[PDB]
Every structure is written in C-alpha cells, then in structure tokens.
Amino acid sequence: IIHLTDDSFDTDVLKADGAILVDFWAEWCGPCKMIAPILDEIADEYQGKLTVAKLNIDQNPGTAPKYGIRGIPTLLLFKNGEVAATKVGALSKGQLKEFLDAN
Amino acid sequence: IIHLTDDSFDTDVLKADGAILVDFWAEWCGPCKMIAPILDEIADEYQGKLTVAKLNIDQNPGTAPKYGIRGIPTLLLFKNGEVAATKVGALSKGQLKEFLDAN
Amino acid sequence: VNNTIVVSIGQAGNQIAASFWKTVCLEHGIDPLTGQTAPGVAPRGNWSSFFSKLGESGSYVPRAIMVDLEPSVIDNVKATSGSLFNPANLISRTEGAGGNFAVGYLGAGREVLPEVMSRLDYEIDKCDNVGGIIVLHAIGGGTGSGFGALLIESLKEKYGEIPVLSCAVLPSPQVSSVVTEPYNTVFALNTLRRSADACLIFDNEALFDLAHRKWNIESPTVDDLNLLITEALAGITASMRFEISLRELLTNLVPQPSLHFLMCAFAPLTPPDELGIEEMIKSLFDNGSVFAACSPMEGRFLSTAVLYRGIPLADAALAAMREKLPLTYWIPTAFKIGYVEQPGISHRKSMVLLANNTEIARVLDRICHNFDKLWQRKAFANWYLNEGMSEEQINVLRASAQELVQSYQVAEE
Amino acid sequence: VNNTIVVSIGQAGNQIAASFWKTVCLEHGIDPLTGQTAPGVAPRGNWSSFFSKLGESSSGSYVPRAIMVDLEPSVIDNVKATSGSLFNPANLISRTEGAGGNFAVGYLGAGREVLPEVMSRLDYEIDKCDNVGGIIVLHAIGGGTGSGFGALLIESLKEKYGEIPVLSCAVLPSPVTEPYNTVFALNTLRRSADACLIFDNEALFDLAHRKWNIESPTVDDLNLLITEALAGITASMRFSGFLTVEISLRELLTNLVPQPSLHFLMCAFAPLTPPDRSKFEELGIEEMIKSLFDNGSVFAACSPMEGRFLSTAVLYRGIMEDKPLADAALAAMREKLPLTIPTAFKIGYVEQPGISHRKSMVLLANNTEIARVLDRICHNFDKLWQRKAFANWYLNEGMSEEQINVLRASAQELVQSYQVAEE
Ligand SMILES: Nc1nc2c(ncn2[C@@H]2O[C@H](COP(=O)(O)OP(=O)(O)OP(=O)(O)O)[C@@H](O)[C@H]2O)c(=O)[nH]1
Numbered sequence A, B: 001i002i003h004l005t006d007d008s009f010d011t012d013v014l015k016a017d018g019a020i021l022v023d024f025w026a027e028w029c030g031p032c033k034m035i036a037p038i039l040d041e042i043a044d045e046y047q048g049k050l051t052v053a054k055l056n057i058d059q060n061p062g063t064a065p066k067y068g069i070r071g072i073p074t075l076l077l078f079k080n081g082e083v084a085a086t087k088v089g090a091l092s093k094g095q096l097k098e099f100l101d102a103n
Numbered sequence C: 001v002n003n004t005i006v007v008s009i010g011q012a013g014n015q016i017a018a019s020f021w022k023t024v025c026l027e028h029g030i031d032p033l034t035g036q037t038a039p040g041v042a043p044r045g046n047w048s049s050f051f052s053k054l055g056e057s058g059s060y061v062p063r064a065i066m067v068d069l070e071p072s073v074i075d076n077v078k079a080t081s082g083s084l085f086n087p088a089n090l091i092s093r094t095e096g097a098g099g100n101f102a103v104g105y106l107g108a109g110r111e112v113l114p115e116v117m118s119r120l121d122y123e124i125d126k127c128d129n130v131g132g133i134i135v136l137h138a139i140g141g142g143t144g145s146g147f148g149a150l151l152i153e154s155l156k157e158k159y160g161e162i163p164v165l166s167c168a169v170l171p172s173p174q175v176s177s178v179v180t181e182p183y184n185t186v187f188a189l190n191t192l193r194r195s196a197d198a199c200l201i202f203d204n205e206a207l208f209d210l211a212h213r214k215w216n217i218e219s220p221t222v223d224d225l226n227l228l229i230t231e232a233l234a235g236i237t238a239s240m241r242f243e244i245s246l247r248e249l250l251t252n253l254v255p256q257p258s259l260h261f262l263m264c265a266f267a268p269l270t271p272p273d274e275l276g277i278e279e280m281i282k283s284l285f286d287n288g289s290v291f292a293a294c295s296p297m298e299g300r301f302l303s304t305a306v307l308y309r310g311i312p313l314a315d316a317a318l319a320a321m322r323e324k325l326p327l328t329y330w331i332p333t334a335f336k337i338g339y340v341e342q343p344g345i346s347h348r349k350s351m352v353l354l355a356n357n358t359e360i361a362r363v364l365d366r367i368c369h370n371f372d373k374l375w376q377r378k379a380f381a382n383w384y385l386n387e388g389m390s391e392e393q394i395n396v397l398r399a400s401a402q403e404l405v406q407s408y409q410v411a412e413e
Numbered sequence D: 001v002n003n004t005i006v007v008s009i010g011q012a013g014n015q016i017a018a019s020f021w022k023t024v025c026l027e028h029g030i031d032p033l034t035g036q037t038a039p040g041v042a043p044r045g046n047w048s049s050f051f052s053k054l055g056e057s058s059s060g061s062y063v064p065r066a067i068m069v070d071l072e073p074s075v076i077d078n079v080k081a082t083s084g085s086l087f088n089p090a091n092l093i094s095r096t097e098g099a100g101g102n103f104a105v106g107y108l109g110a111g112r113e114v115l116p117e118v119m120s121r122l123d124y125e126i127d128k129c130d131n132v133g134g135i136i137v138l139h140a141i142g143g144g145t146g147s148g149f150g151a152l153l154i155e156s157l158k159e160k161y162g163e164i165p166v167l168s169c170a171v172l173p174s175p176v177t178e179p180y181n182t183v184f185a186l187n188t189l190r191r192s193a194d195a196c197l198i199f200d201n202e203a204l205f206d207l208a209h210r211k212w213n214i215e216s217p218t219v220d221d222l223n224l225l226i227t228e229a230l231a232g233i234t235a236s237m238r239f240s241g242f243l244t245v246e247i248s249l250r251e252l253l254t255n256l257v258p259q260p261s262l263h264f265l266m267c268a269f270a271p272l273t274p275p276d277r278s279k280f281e282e283l284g285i286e287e288m289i290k291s292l293f294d295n296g297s298v299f300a301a302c303s304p305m306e307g308r309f310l311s312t313a314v315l316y317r318g319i320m321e322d323k324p325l326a327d328a329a330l331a332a333m334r335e336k337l338p339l340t341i342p343t344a345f346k347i348g349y350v351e352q353p354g355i356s357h358r359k360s361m362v363l364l365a366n367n368t369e370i371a372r373v374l375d376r377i378c379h380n381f382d383k384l385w386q387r388k389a390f391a392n393w394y395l396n397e398g399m400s401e402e403q404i405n406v407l408r409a410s411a412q413e414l415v416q417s418y419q420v421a422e423e
C-alpha cells in the first residue's frame, strides 16, 4: 500500500518505471471506503505488473486539480508520467480487472 | 382402503408387519378430501411395499392425541409399532412419492 | 446501567434468539463462539445491559435462557455457539408439546417450570439493576404459547415490579391444512393481555409477504422470516445497548394497561442483493412496511417510537410525519425519537418504528375468526378437554380475546 | 441411492471431519449432538447416502457413515467431547504416540498396527451399505499420520475393494519436515487414489486474512472454507428434487478425470463473503459467477487462468433468481477458458441451499497450474534433501535413501505430466 503526498507524487508516480494505479480518495467519502479492501487484492494479483498508490485529497489538495478530477473515488492509471486510463466511482473487483486487463 | 377404529389400531397398525401409512382425517376438512383420490393411487403403485390406512378423528377421538397430531390431514408412516415419518397437510401425488421413496 | 434478560421459548423463539444473540454479539464486538473480545480492549457500548462478565483479561455471557420441550433446536444452538451461553440456562425436554397449548401450560410445561424459574431467580439476582425481561416465543404451537403463558404468569406473580415484554410470533393462516394453531394463539393472548406489560406482535403472514415482495425471495424460508425479526429486535434493543431501560421504553408506548399491544416496522427493506433520509422515513411509515397484516395509516396511533441507527434534516421529516398521523383523541399520545451511533452490521444506517395502533384489531380479529371456524364444530375439542381444560374455560378465553379487540375498536372512537 | 463413507486421518483430517459432519447434520435436520430428529420427523433429503439408521424411530439414531483414525488421541478425544452420541464409538480409532510429523511412522511403524482395526471397521460400514458409491479420505499430508497412514490406507483400500471410487481430499502445508511428508504422500495419491482434491493452506490463509479481515487466522477459520466446499460438492449426492441434478462420485470423477495420470483437482467457492455478514449481504449471480472464476477465489496458491483447464464442474445449489442469466454467464465462461486432451464442462444444480448461504457455488477444475503448487513443495523438499536436513529421522525408521529418491522422482513424473498437458 503506497501513500503519497503532493511532494512525493513526482518521484513516486511520474518518474516511476512500470504501470501505476492511483486512488484519489477521502475519509468522508462513502464509496472510497467501499473499494479500500478491493484495492488490496489487486496489489497481490498484479505483482510486478502494477503498483497501487493512494493519495488523500484533504491532506494533499494540490494534485487532483492538475488532473481534472471530477470527484472521488478516482482511479488513475499511469505508465510513464502519463494518465493511461481513468475510472470514476466505486466498482466490482471484476469490472476493475477487465479495466486493468485491456490497458 | 383400510378403515381403522381406536380398538383396531393396535393390531392393524402397531402389530403389523411391513410399512404402513395412516391418514388422520375428517369430513369437515377441505384439504383431507383433496388427497382422498390421491391416496388410492399409492395403494396401487406400492403393492406389497406399503399398506394405506385411514382413521376418522371424529368417530375415533382417542388415537391422534397419542401421536402429537397438530391438525389434519396428517400422514403417518409406521414400520413396526413406530412412526417413521410425518406429512402434515394436503400435497401433490409427486411430493408424496418422493416422501415415500426416501423412507 | 439497567439489565435485560431474554428468555426464549419453543422452536421459533429459540431459532430467533440464536440469530438475535449472534447479531448482538457482532454489534458489540464480542466473539459469538467464545464470548471474548480483542485482547485488552472491551466490548462497544452499554454491553452489561445484555451480557455479564466472568473473569478478567475473561469472557462475556449473554443474559439468556432458552427453553423447549423438545431437544433439537437447543442442541443446534449448542452445536453452533461454542462456549457463548451458560450451559445451566439451556433447558430442554424430549417429547415436545404436540402443538397443544394445554401440554405447555398444564402438562409437561408445568414440570419444567421450576427449573426455568430457578434459572430466572439466578439471572435476576446477579443483575445490579434489572430493567426488564423479554420473552421471545411463537404462539401458534404448544410450547411458546402454553409454557410461554405459564412463565409470564409466574414471573409477574413473583417479581411483579419487573416489566415483561412479550415478542410474539403469530401464525399465518394455513390453506394446506386445518390446524390447532388458532386455539393456541387465543389461549396465549389471554395471558399476554392480562399479565405481560406489553406485547410486540410479529405476524408470520406479513413477514412472508415482506420477504416475497420487498426482499424478492420467490419462496421465503423460515430463516428469511427470522432475519426480518432479528433486525427489528436488534433495532428495538439498540436503544438499550448504546441509554434507555425497557421500562422507560414501555412507559411511553403504553397509555392504558388494556392497550399494550404493539406493531413494528423497519427501513430499509431493500433486498439482500444507500437511501436518502426523507425517503427512508417515508418508507418506514408506509402500510406495506409493518410486520403485521394490517394498514396502520387507516387506523389511529396511540403512541409511536422511532429509533434511528447509524450516520439535522432528520428532525424535520420526522416532525412532518408526526403531524400526518391519525391520532387517538382522549388517550394520551407520544412520539418519541431515538438516535444511536453504532449501526446494524447489515446497514450503514437504518430505522425501526414501534407503534401502538388500533389496526392491531384487524390482525387479532383474523385470529378470532379462524378460531370460531374451528370452535363452531368443536373441531379438536378433546385434544384440549382431555388435558385439563374445560369447555367453559375455552369460551372464557375466547371472550377475553374478543374483549382485547373491543378495546382497540373503542380506542378508534 | 448411493452410499458414501468418509474416513478422516490425523489432526487436520479429523478436525475438518467434525466440522463437515456437524454441517451435514444441520443440512439434513439431524441433531448434531445425538443423531436424532424431532419426534415423528425424518431427516430432509437423501439422508441414507451419508447416514445409517440404528433401531426403532423412538430411541433410535442416525449415524454418520464415518471412521476417524489418529495415532495421537487429543483430537479424537475432542470429537468425543463436542459431539455427544453422534458417532459410532467403534469408528473412532486412536492410539497413544503421535507420529511426530514422520511419514514413515504412519506408513511402516505405528500405522501398520492400527490398520487391521481400521480395515475391519471399513468392512462393517461397507457391508451395511445398499450400494456403496465411494469413499472420501479427509487428511493433511504435511504431518505423519494423515500422510503415512493415509497413504497406507488408500493403498490398502484399493487392493481389497478395487472397484470402489476413492477420492482424497488433501490439505497441503503452507510456506520443519512438512515438505518431506507431502512428497511421500503424493506418490500414493498419484498411483492409488482415483482422484485427489487439494486444499492449499497457503491460499486458505490468504483468503481468511484478505476476504475476511482476520489478522491471525486459526485452523477453525480455514476449516470453514473447506467445509463449505465439501458440503457443496457432496450436495449432489445428498438431495433430490424436481430440479435437482443428482450426480454420483463415480459420475463426477469420470467427468473431471480425462486420464488416470491427470487426477489432481482444485476448487473455488463463492460467495467468499465474510460469515459476519453472511445472510445480510448477498452477491447477485453476476458478481458470484465472476468471483467463482477469479484467480483470487481458488483454494490453491496459483492462477488457474494462466494455465489450462482439462476439465470443469460448476456445482450450484440454493436459490436460482435468474436462470437465463446464469446460463448466459456459464456459456460465456465456457468460451473464455484456456483449454488443452478434450475438455468437459459439467453443470450441476441442487435445490437445497446450505445452512449459511441462500445460494452458493463450488468450482472443481482439473487445471495445469496445480503444477505451481506442486513445484513450490518440491523446491522446499529439494532445499532440505540437498543437505539431508532431517534425513536420519526417516532413515532410522525403515525407508532407504534410494527409495525416497524414487518418491521424489515419482512426484516429478506427476509435475511433468501437468506441464506437458499445458503446452
Ligand atoms: N417467524 C418464525 N415462525 C416460526 C418459526 N418456527 C416455527 N414458526 C411458526 O410458529 C408456529 C409454531 O410454533 P413453534 O415455536 O415452532 O412450536 P412450539 O409451540 O414452540 O413447540 P411445540 O408445541 O412442541 O410444537 C407455526 O405457526 C410456525 O409457522 C421460526 O423460526 N420463525
């Protein structure tokens, strides 16, 4: 489980080798808590293939506005320093996979 | 079709060799009349395998209370002098068979 | 902190209790198989109201007594609940009550009464402050009805100052068969009426319908019906577990001792497959939401308690609802609102409605009429007559129910 | 109607056995502490498949067609303590020593001593069957009783009865001498068992921690998962009904095993919803079927989708809300699976739900990724045997050094079989 700050985003996400999934979230977001246990399973089954990161938008208000986030939870797939795909809202552990499989 | 009294229950049901199905019933019971034609079919198809008996609880009030009957119709399966299984209420000729097949 | 004991009786009663206790354990963070909580930390809320503690860093034991005249349900609870319950408080005999009120009240139930009362004596004594006993039982059979009525009477004779709430499961009309159930129900009703301090009804017909229509189960299981009851019961007791006593709760619900019958409703009734607060309240009060086969909105409310559970505007919609209820005019009314932080494990937020409503009369008159169908021809008379009841005694009890109905009929002006 | 006898060996075996029988009693309405039913009532379902009736209906009893064997007595003592008069006391056989985690003790030492009694109880159970349809052997293979005597008894079973199907349900250790015992047991499971269903403790551990939030999972937690799967697999044999597709152990293994050399199976279950919420929270059919075929749902630390399916059975039970949807879904899965050796895709349905889920599914598969689980084991065995770690343990016990090489080679012959089936 990788926690991020605004200061660490550059190195952790953008300068990163290999694919990375970022969960922009908050404590006061019902649906965000819903997928917290789901995201842990993917951190196992996509070992080496993916790294899973989290950014809490309350304590780090600087990053989300840069990416045009419309709400939370927002899953962002990064490859180099680039957004590959986007998932908005809480979802099944199965729809998440089909999303990861194709990109 | 075997009719019973309280006096004949002992010999006819309890001292009986082989399996026996007893229908505790009444004329003023809607559901009891419902299965009267059904019980005749089983008296044919289970020849030797089963004997089918009837006890009218109005004219023989002594027997049902001994067996903890909660209402009518009540089908009781006897083997020796023992209640093997119990069916309460009117039923299909098919559910009756699956009940007889298993016991 | 007031203490509550739960005495469950017969098949239904003990099956419901088993599921009640597992749930309440989970809500408090108590392990339902051992009675233990995470090392160091304690159970959530006012746990001592329903549990009592054994050692130190120790086990939590439900204030529970389970009774049956047949062994198999209580044996299921033993197989499936580890060291949770007090072994001395699980009491069973062998032969059952054969669906006969009289065996429960005059026959075999009379024989277990002392042991049961002994266990009650012990659970009452170990309470620092006994707030109430709750009796869970179905009243269609012989044990929950006959022994249930016997125990209630015994309890009020000896303790008297202790409030007794009966949570009574009523039988749905049978169409496949003609059964003794109406007799048993009416016989039990007499006691519920004269001795219990309140009786909360659970109509099997409505629960089936709720499972079939709102939960979407093609053909509901007894286990589906019990889960409906469990969550209502978890909700009612929530106000006492996180605080108000059973006595304070019944005081506000009951304005006259001759009008102490209750119905309940639950929200959300969504299939086991999150709602706005205004619509939750709207649902909670709809006729198709009550755990009885009647329409509360077409009768009158004597008194109401709403107990909300979970996560302002909440006070506005409840106020609006208050003003829309048809009220009994000369009897004193109450509309009590409760809030509890800790949610049911089922739903992030939920509500129970407890209500004293005159429509209970249509439910009771349905039972009376099924009885009269049987009694007009002395249908199963000798079942009861050859077990200690007289013909005159049956009539007296039948008249007692008719009087209960009449009470609520009068309350409706 | 087919009869099944369940033989359980060693700690794991018997603890699982106890949990299985309690659940089965509850499904059939049989009192799990006394073998009785309420006055006048018979059990639900086809109870005689797994139970025999003792005596009259009054004081009589329904007795699990069960035999429990151990060397150490603690576990069978515990069964006696928790299970009233359910079992036939003559079918609970134990001694005094444990096998001390030594396969050779169970196979050649103290195990040989228990065999005539155990075999004699098998005789008695067998003969009192109208028609015996199979024997299920419940055991862990990381210790010395389940592995050694499990090996001894399956061999013995096949020599004496031959034609009777024998299915092993075998628990595998999670990453002591466990890798040694596993490998030794595998030989017999390869050569003599008609089929072997693995339960990988590593996967069970993860599921219990992951899906259920148990920080420190116990064996009780792991046994819940196994029990559900066992109840679910045996439901086709224990119930009948208008829509119930009755399937014998014979028919099941026939469809799951395409060649005698490929008879190792894995299983998945759904829903894996935490017991905490079991009846209050339900999955729809979609999510349920989806989950069933997910890599994170198999009782094996590996990924069936990255390998190839040789064969498959989906065993559904309980409520069916939407049969066109379920058929559409299974048909879609059937066309999505990586395939080899011609495949089978069998679907079973049982009306009766289990005791904890309104509807549930078990997936049994013959899949080539079982090679991964087996590979993990052999790498650990080789890591100890390369330096002869606890070798004298087994040498001083009757096994010869060259003969354990044979068994390491035997298991390798099985791991190569599944690798060949993939490419
Ligand atoms: N809601 C609900 N109703 C039940 C349950 N079990 C039985 N019933 C109903 O309750 C009535 C029977 O009462 P029981 O509690 O089962 O029987 P008992 O009177 O307590 O015991 P006996 O007289 O020996 O038969 C019937 O109308 C059944 O429909 C249950 O678990 N939940």
Ligand SMILES: Nc1nc2c(ncn2[C@@H]2O[C@H](COP(=O)(O)OP(=O)(O)OP(=O)(O)O)[C@@H](O)[C@H]2O)c(=O)[nH]1
Pocket (backbone or CB within 6 Å): D009, D010, D011, D012, D013, D015, D016, D071, D072, D097, D098, D099, D100, D101, D102, D140, D141, D142, D143, D144, D145, D146, D147, D171, D172, D173, D174, D178, D201, D204, D219, D220, D222, D223
């Ligand atoms: N899933 C599960 N695994 C178990 C259980 N009990 C033991 N195990 C595992 O089984 C393996 C040990 O095998 P045992 O059955 O305990 O040994 P045994 O043959 O019974 O007894 P000994 O030969 O005397 O040691 C280890 O991998 C344990 O983690 C259980 O109840 N459930």
